[PDB]
Structure formats: C-alpha cells, structure tokens
C-alpha cells in the first residue's frame, strides 16, 4: 500500500462535512492499495448555465481526491496543499454521478503528482487531470 | 472592445441562477472593453477541510469567468466549451471574497486562450490560471 495514514471510508467522508466537499456531495467510495475513488452528482450545484457539468466542478472533484490521497501518503502533522492542477475536458456530462479515480504518478519527499480520471455512468472518460501537491 | 455580444452585467449575473455559479455566489462585477471580472466568497461552500479556499473553487471561478468572456466573443448560436485548463495556486486565501480578472491571450476562429488571475481582498495574487476553449 502507498498509504502512511490509516483512515476509514467513514472517517474520510466525515472530512467533507461543512466545507466544499460536503456541499457538492462528493463521496469517497473506495480506498484501494494504490488508488482512491470518489463520486459527485451532476446537478444544479455542479452545472454550468447551459446544462452541462461545470468544467470547474470536475476540477474540484480531482483536486479533492488528489489532495486527500496526497495527505494519506504523509504522516504526523505534515500537510498537503494543491500547487498546480490541470485538466482536459474530453466529454461533457449532463446527469447522474461522475466517478473520479486517482492514482500516484510521483510520491516525493516534498512534492507529489497525482493522476485523476473522471468517468460518467457509462464508464466513458469525461476529464483527465493532473495535480501537483506541495508537502508542508 | 473584444466582445461580439452585447450583454448587461445584470443579464450576465442572471445566467448563474439555478446552477453552480449562482450556488457559490459568484458575481460578475465589471465588463471592461477587454477584461471581465467576477468575485467569489471564501466560505463553507468553497473551503477545503483545513480552512483554506479549495484550489478547485479557484478553478470554478476561472473557468466561469473565462468561458463567459469566451462566449461574449462569439455570435449567434456559436457555443463555447472549456477544453483545457491549468492553474497555479501560489498563495492560500482564507477569508472574505476573491476577485478574478480575465484577459484574452489569444482570440481565434475556433479556439481561445484566456488568462485569469485571482486576488484576495488585500490584492495579493492567489491563483493564476489559463483556460483554452473550443468554439462549436
Ligand atoms: C524535485 C521534483 C521536481 C519534486 O519532487 P520532490 O518531492 O521535491 O523531491 P524528491 O524527494 O522526489 O527527490 C527528487 C530528486 O531531487 C533531489 N532533491 C530533492 N530535494 C533536494 C534539495 N533540497 N536539494 C538538492 N536536491 C534535492 C533528490 O536528491 C532527488 O534526486 P535524484 O533524482 O537524483 O534521486 C522531482 O519530481 C524531480 O526531480 N523531477 C525532475 C525535474 C527535471 O528533471 N526537470 C527537467 C530538467 S530541469 C529544466 C530544464 O530543462 C533546464 C533547461 C535549461 C537550463 C536549466 C534547466
Ligand atoms: C506554500 C506554497 C505552496 C509555496 O510557497 P512559495 O513557493 O515558497 O512562494 P512564496 O515565498 O511567495 O510563499 C507564499 C506565502 O506562503 C507562505 N508560506 C510559505 N511556506 C509556508 C508554510 N509551510 N505554511 C504556511 N505558509 C507558508 C509564505 O510565507 C508566503 O506568505 P507571506 O508572504 O504572507 O508571508 C505557496 O505557494 C502556497 O501556499 N500556495 C497555496 C496552496 C493552496 O492553498 N492550494 C489550495 C488549497 S489545498 C488543496 C485543496 O483544495 C484540498 C481539497 C481537499 C482536501 C485537502 C486539500
């Protein structure tokens, strides 16, 4: 396992309460040995004015999963913040929930790089994102 | 002026009602002859679990301002969608509202590139973002 912190899904989902993660109903659904996965609804809270998933909402999902995964790969009072993030919106979404899957590209002593792919309910890729974190 | 559509600030702000823009109290505040500006609160809707503005929330603001400016530089039934986005989180925001200022880097026939800088209430740069759009 890449993780250094041991956390439960329930405890992970409690982290979002009362901040942006909870307000968008981002739910962590699986902690793998080297992956982290969360879903997010496509509705009035996450759509742009023309009925599509907001490109920024996909990025909120990516930065949420990658930063939390980043945090879980540190120990003690180390913190992890997003330093640079980028994304390509390859397909639009309109309804249902999208699913983000995050895996590590680099786990360094001072920086990390995460890949997050976001899929719709038919399993089609909608967003491909890379997040670089700084360990403080 | 770079705009091809004539829209009022009130009409711009009406676009966000019932979607993510309205949900987050993103408010368009100024249309320049070649800049667009909007603000966004740093609060429970936009913070990450450790009290900072969520890096994804900055990107929601950037993609919101950039995509609308992009749309205003097209005409009739032309649509504008975000294609690629990247952002540098150079300083944390913690309170008040942040202000995004959007300027064109490239305005093309089938694509645009927008620069959006996001400042805190003390005028310090917190996020610097670039959005690439596709015109459909
Ligand atoms: C350091 C990065 C960026 C972040 O991860 P991180 O968490 O921060 O650090 P890591 O723990 O993962 O350890 C990584 C390595 O860094 C070293 N080190 C760490 N801290 C220090 C330190 N305080 N002091 C000294 N060394 C330090 C380690 O010893 C380790 O070394 P090694 O590899 O020999 O075992 C890491 O991802 C990286 O090296 N990316 C490749 C960058 C690249 O090749 N870019 C392209 C080329 S440069 C641009 C260009 O083209 C150019 C053109 C013209 C002119 C000029 C330039
Ligand atoms: C500290 C960074 C990363 C590097 O700084 P740098 O390269 O050296 O550049 P500067 O020298 O200009 O420093 C600038 C200011 O930072 C201060 N400072 C320096 N070191 C520390 C420190 N150890 N502690 C505290 N402050 C420190 C400096 O003193 C200076 O302050 P000042 O001038 O007033 O005295 C800086 O770029 C930054 O904070 N970016 C924002 C990251 C961000 O908010 N991402 C989004 C949120 S996290 C992801 C997320 O959404 C998420 C979601 C779900 C779950 C979890 C998460």
XYZ file of C-alpha atoms and ligand atoms in Angstrom:
386
model
C 0.000 0.000 0.000
C 1.205 3.534 -0.682
C -0.663 4.994 2.314
C 1.091 6.084 5.511
C -2.073 7.104 7.345
C -4.711 4.536 8.203
C -8.196 6.002 7.787
C -11.670 4.557 7.305
C -14.024 5.491 4.466
C -16.476 6.772 7.076
C -13.811 8.979 8.650
C -12.723 10.170 5.200
C -16.292 11.096 4.304
C -16.615 12.946 7.622
C -13.786 15.252 6.480
C -16.011 16.946 3.891
C -18.803 17.952 6.261
C -19.312 21.719 6.376
C -16.848 22.525 3.598
C -16.911 22.441 -0.227
C -16.527 18.650 -0.334
C -19.765 18.091 1.593
C -21.604 20.912 -0.212
C -21.051 19.194 -3.578
C -21.943 15.737 -2.181
C -18.523 14.399 -3.095
C -18.430 10.912 -1.587
C -15.343 8.738 -1.267
C -16.373 5.244 -2.269
C -13.237 3.087 -2.395
C -9.749 3.103 -0.936
C -7.564 0.696 -2.892
C -3.977 -0.226 -2.119
C -2.746 2.446 -4.521
C -5.911 4.228 -5.709
C -8.634 6.473 -4.316
C -12.116 6.898 -5.764
C -14.973 9.377 -5.199
C -18.238 10.287 -6.944
C -20.033 13.612 -7.454
C -23.546 14.388 -8.658
C -24.259 16.300 -11.851
C -26.999 18.749 -10.866
C -27.732 22.382 -10.050
C -24.815 22.509 -7.584
C -22.238 21.418 -10.171
C -23.615 22.505 -13.574
C -22.797 25.490 -15.769
C -25.547 27.748 -17.199
C -26.143 25.593 -20.302
C -26.966 22.304 -18.607
C -23.550 20.638 -18.582
C -21.288 19.608 -15.735
C -19.210 22.692 -14.917
C -15.603 22.179 -16.007
C -14.614 23.654 -12.650
C -16.688 21.089 -10.761
C -14.699 18.270 -12.401
C -11.572 20.010 -11.200
C -12.983 20.384 -7.658
C -13.501 16.594 -7.704
C -9.954 15.973 -8.991
C -8.243 18.315 -6.539
C -10.315 16.859 -3.683
C -9.340 13.263 -4.422
C -5.687 14.010 -5.194
C -5.158 16.241 -2.161
C -6.745 13.712 0.218
C -4.767 10.880 -1.344
C -1.730 13.115 -1.017
C -2.474 13.700 2.674
C -2.899 9.960 3.252
C 0.642 9.490 1.922
C 2.146 11.771 4.575
C 2.462 11.286 8.339
C 2.021 13.215 11.584
C 1.460 16.938 11.212
C 2.586 17.093 7.596
C 0.038 18.935 5.439
C -0.605 18.708 1.710
C -1.799 21.615 -0.456
C -2.531 21.783 -4.174
C 0.265 23.585 -6.012
C -0.685 23.201 -9.670
C -3.618 21.495 -11.291
C -4.596 20.962 -14.870
C -7.309 19.087 -16.692
C -8.689 18.230 -20.077
C -12.465 18.096 -20.547
C -12.762 15.321 -23.127
C -16.510 14.653 -22.822
C -19.437 16.534 -21.319
C -21.782 15.083 -18.691
C -25.408 16.052 -18.081
C -26.956 13.846 -15.412
C -26.237 11.204 -12.803
C -22.958 10.993 -10.891
C -19.409 11.090 -12.247
C -16.653 8.943 -10.731
C -13.083 10.101 -10.122
C -10.234 7.596 -9.898
C -6.900 8.776 -8.598
C -3.508 7.084 -8.801
C 0.006 8.303 -7.958
C 2.499 9.492 -10.578
C 5.142 10.753 -8.136
C 5.359 10.367 -4.359
C 8.286 12.534 -3.322
C 9.541 13.944 -0.046
C 8.394 17.487 -0.834
C 6.021 17.243 -3.832
C 3.576 14.691 -5.239
C 1.902 14.278 -8.606
C -1.481 12.588 -8.927
C -3.428 11.460 -11.983
C -7.207 11.689 -11.730
C -9.544 10.331 -14.390
C -13.241 11.172 -14.148
C -15.794 8.889 -15.798
C -19.544 9.082 -16.419
C -22.034 6.334 -15.553
C -21.492 4.576 -18.882
C -17.819 4.377 -17.959
C -16.727 6.945 -20.531
C -13.828 9.276 -19.737
C -15.007 12.874 -19.232
C -11.985 14.501 -17.582
C -8.281 13.690 -17.409
C -6.462 15.684 -14.719
C -3.019 16.018 -13.137
C -2.469 17.550 -9.687
C 0.879 18.556 -8.242
C 0.937 18.952 -4.463
C 3.357 20.551 -2.039
C 4.070 18.842 1.287
C 4.263 21.368 4.116
C -13.789 46.207 -27.476
C -13.337 42.457 -27.982
C -16.964 41.472 -27.367
C -19.321 40.499 -30.203
C -22.372 40.097 -27.968
C -23.901 42.979 -26.076
C -24.969 41.860 -22.611
C -25.632 43.736 -19.391
C -23.993 42.918 -16.081
C -27.457 42.149 -14.707
C -28.109 39.735 -17.576
C -24.665 38.144 -17.066
C -25.476 37.612 -13.414
C -28.859 36.117 -14.268
C -27.093 33.310 -16.196
C -25.783 31.784 -12.978
C -29.187 31.342 -11.339
C -30.076 27.694 -10.733
C -26.584 26.402 -11.432
C -23.139 26.261 -9.770
C -22.309 29.928 -10.383
C -25.404 31.117 -8.527
C -24.947 28.440 -5.846
C -21.475 29.774 -4.984
C -22.460 33.484 -5.119
C -20.051 34.141 -7.979
C -20.848 37.703 -9.013
C -19.773 39.426 -12.209
C -18.737 42.938 -11.218
C -17.180 44.621 -14.242
C -17.086 44.299 -18.005
C -14.119 46.156 -19.448
C -13.516 46.699 -23.134
C -11.169 43.706 -22.984
C -11.429 42.321 -19.433
C -14.092 40.580 -17.370
C -14.130 40.494 -13.582
C -16.020 38.393 -11.022
C -15.803 37.735 -7.288
C -16.437 34.671 -5.157
C -16.700 34.182 -1.405
C -14.207 32.195 0.645
C -16.644 30.382 2.956
C -18.088 26.993 3.823
C -19.164 26.439 0.184
C -15.681 26.989 -1.235
C -13.239 25.953 1.518
C -11.319 22.680 1.810
C -11.411 20.663 5.091
C -8.467 22.595 6.597
C -9.908 26.099 6.264
C -8.284 27.268 3.019
C -10.053 28.222 -0.180
C -10.354 24.971 -2.141
C -7.999 25.045 -5.126
C -10.839 23.629 -7.185
C -13.015 26.593 -6.226
C -10.469 28.958 -7.764
C -10.718 26.906 -10.924
C -14.524 27.097 -10.881
C -14.155 30.903 -10.798
C -11.523 30.923 -13.545
C -13.452 28.570 -15.827
C -16.678 30.520 -15.116
C -15.164 33.878 -15.998
C -13.118 32.600 -18.936
C -15.952 30.615 -20.539
C -18.362 33.548 -20.305
C -15.825 36.016 -21.717
C -15.256 33.446 -24.445
C -18.975 33.215 -25.161
C -19.195 37.050 -25.313
C -16.572 36.978 -28.068
C -18.739 34.724 -30.253
C -22.045 35.428 -32.001
C -25.478 33.899 -32.546
C -25.699 30.168 -31.934
C -21.952 29.604 -31.525
C -21.195 27.712 -28.319
C -18.052 27.856 -26.203
C -16.850 24.974 -24.019
C -13.780 24.641 -21.810
C -11.260 22.315 -23.427
C -8.133 22.635 -21.307
C -7.410 24.414 -18.028
C -4.413 24.785 -15.740
C -3.908 26.769 -12.556
C -1.126 27.728 -10.180
C -2.091 28.017 -6.530
C 0.616 30.439 -5.421
C -0.968 31.759 -2.193
C -3.774 30.479 0.036
C -6.918 32.534 0.500
C -8.622 32.218 3.862
C -11.450 34.749 4.204
C -13.511 37.459 2.507
C -14.050 37.315 -1.245
C -11.556 36.665 -4.021
C -11.609 38.568 -7.315
C -10.868 37.020 -10.696
C -9.653 39.207 -13.553
C -9.838 37.686 -17.012
C -7.952 38.846 -20.135
C -7.509 37.337 -23.600
C -4.173 35.830 -24.583
C -5.448 34.561 -27.914
C -8.771 35.045 -29.670
C -9.096 32.701 -32.652
C -11.789 31.481 -35.017
C -12.159 28.049 -33.439
C -10.326 28.418 -30.100
C -9.478 30.978 -27.425
C -6.887 31.214 -24.681
C -7.797 33.248 -21.586
C -5.678 34.305 -18.617
C -7.482 34.616 -15.277
C -5.740 35.981 -12.200
C -7.414 35.622 -8.804
C -6.568 38.046 -5.985
C -7.513 38.073 -2.279
C -9.079 41.071 -0.500
C -5.623 42.529 0.134
C -4.855 42.445 -3.586
C -2.372 39.578 -3.352
C -2.302 37.075 -6.228
C -3.505 33.659 -5.078
C -4.271 31.816 -8.296
C -3.063 32.287 -11.857
C -4.977 30.239 -14.415
C -5.141 29.626 -18.170
C -8.244 28.359 -19.970
C -8.329 27.030 -23.504
C -11.783 26.945 -25.089
C -13.205 25.335 -28.216
C -15.777 27.233 -30.253
C -18.510 24.907 -31.541
C 12.289 17.646 -7.404
C 10.983 17.227 -8.021
C 10.585 18.227 -9.085
C 9.890 17.161 -6.984
O 9.920 16.050 -6.078
P 10.429 16.288 -4.595
O 9.468 15.666 -3.608
O 10.508 17.779 -4.368
O 11.891 15.672 -4.404
P 12.142 14.121 -4.404
O 12.119 13.655 -2.931
O 11.105 13.342 -5.248
O 13.624 13.832 -4.964
C 13.956 14.110 -6.261
C 15.400 14.443 -6.570
O 15.668 15.775 -6.227
C 16.684 15.747 -5.224
N 16.307 16.718 -4.253
C 15.165 16.874 -3.576
N 15.272 17.936 -2.754
C 16.530 18.451 -2.928
C 17.230 19.569 -2.341
N 16.561 20.384 -1.354
N 18.482 19.831 -2.723
C 19.118 19.070 -3.652
N 18.488 18.008 -4.223
C 17.197 17.690 -3.875
C 16.761 14.317 -4.771
O 18.062 14.024 -4.368
C 16.346 13.555 -5.895
O 17.463 13.409 -6.749
P 17.622 12.167 -7.686
O 16.623 12.256 -8.768
O 18.985 12.181 -8.308
O 17.409 10.889 -6.887
C 11.135 15.828 -8.672
O 9.939 15.477 -9.197
C 12.087 15.855 -9.840
O 13.294 15.797 -9.699
N 11.545 15.977 -11.189
C 12.505 16.030 -12.297
C 12.901 17.513 -12.671
C 13.515 17.664 -14.053
O 14.360 16.797 -14.465
N 13.130 18.772 -14.900
C 13.755 18.877 -16.218
C 15.113 19.372 -16.221
S 15.407 20.980 -15.433
C 14.729 22.238 -16.518
C 15.499 22.411 -17.842
O 15.217 21.686 -18.810
C 16.570 23.428 -17.920
C 16.971 23.951 -19.147
C 17.983 24.907 -19.195
C 18.598 25.349 -18.022
C 18.199 24.827 -16.790
C 17.186 23.863 -16.741
C 3.410 27.407 0.461
C 3.422 27.356 -1.040
C 2.889 26.016 -1.505
C 4.818 27.591 -1.537
O 5.296 28.905 -1.255
P 6.473 29.560 -2.088
O 6.771 28.815 -3.350
O 7.709 29.493 -1.232
O 6.055 31.051 -2.505
P 6.084 32.264 -1.509
O 7.511 32.509 -0.957
O 5.603 33.530 -2.270
O 5.064 31.947 -0.307
C 3.804 32.487 -0.287
C 3.184 32.615 1.086
O 3.075 31.329 1.642
C 3.775 31.400 2.885
N 4.332 30.136 3.209
C 5.457 29.548 2.794
N 5.582 28.354 3.415
C 4.505 28.206 4.251
C 4.087 27.166 5.169
N 4.873 25.967 5.323
N 2.957 27.316 5.855
C 2.192 28.427 5.724
N 2.558 29.427 4.879
C 3.709 29.335 4.136
C 4.780 32.487 2.677
O 5.276 32.943 3.899
C 4.038 33.444 1.950
O 3.210 34.150 2.861
P 3.557 35.630 3.248
O 4.253 36.317 2.085
O 2.310 36.341 3.596
O 4.468 35.629 4.430
C 2.541 28.502 -1.580
O 2.608 28.553 -2.940
C 1.082 28.321 -1.230
O 0.671 28.370 -0.077
N 0.145 28.066 -2.319
C -1.271 27.883 -1.997
C -1.708 26.373 -1.802
C -3.216 26.234 -1.734
O -3.886 26.995 -0.953
N -3.902 25.262 -2.559
C -5.355 25.172 -2.439
C -5.803 24.576 -1.201
S -5.156 22.934 -0.780
C -5.838 21.759 -1.945
C -7.342 21.508 -1.717
O -8.176 22.252 -2.266
C -7.782 20.395 -0.843
C -9.031 19.808 -1.039
C -9.453 18.772 -0.215
C -8.622 18.305 0.804
C -7.370 18.888 1.007
C -6.954 19.934 0.180
